[PDB]
Design a protein around this ligand. Structure first.
Ligand SMILES: [Cl-]
Lengths: 64, 78
């Protein structure tokens, strides 16, 4: 009867909620992974900017 | 700066200390991204925007003021 349909309805609900949690999980672990990647990119870029400043100064006169 | 406050004989001590700093940079570079050791050194030595660094200039300073007037060469011991 209506309880048997309720069991089917809540199983369906369980499947959708489970899938939503899987999307959330992915979103969180994607954020974390990109945070690392952006940190690594900033690290290398900062160094490359510093190196250029240095090399330029080897070829250019100072301020009076 | 320590070199600049001492006579020419202290240059050996300087060299040892510079080598410890080089090792320090190397140990730190395993985990951190730092400016190259040579770049760091040339900057500290004021040898980036100038042709002769502080070490070179202090050597001549000490030659002129201490080594030439105060030293006695022994040809047998060199
Ligand atoms: Cl010392």
């Amino acid at each position: 009867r209506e309880i048997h349909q309720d069991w089917a309805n809540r199983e369906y609900i369980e499947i959708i909620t489970s899938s939503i949690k899987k999307i959330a999980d992915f979103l969180n672990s994607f954020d974390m992974s990109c945070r690392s990647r952006l940190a690594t990119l900033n690290e290398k870029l900062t160094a490359l900017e510093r190196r250029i400043e240095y090399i330029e100064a080897r070829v250019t006169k100072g301020e009076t | 700066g320590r070199f600049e406050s001492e006579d020419l004989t202290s240059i050996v001590e300087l060299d040892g200390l510079l080598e410890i700093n080089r090792m320090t940079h190397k140990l730190l570079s395993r985990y951190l991204t730092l400016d190259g050791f040579d770049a760091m050194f040339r900057e500290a030595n004021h040898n980036v925007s100038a042709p002769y660094g502080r070490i070179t200039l202090h050597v001549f300073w000490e030659l002129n003021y201490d080594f030439l007037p105060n030293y006695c060469y022994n040809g047998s011991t060199n």
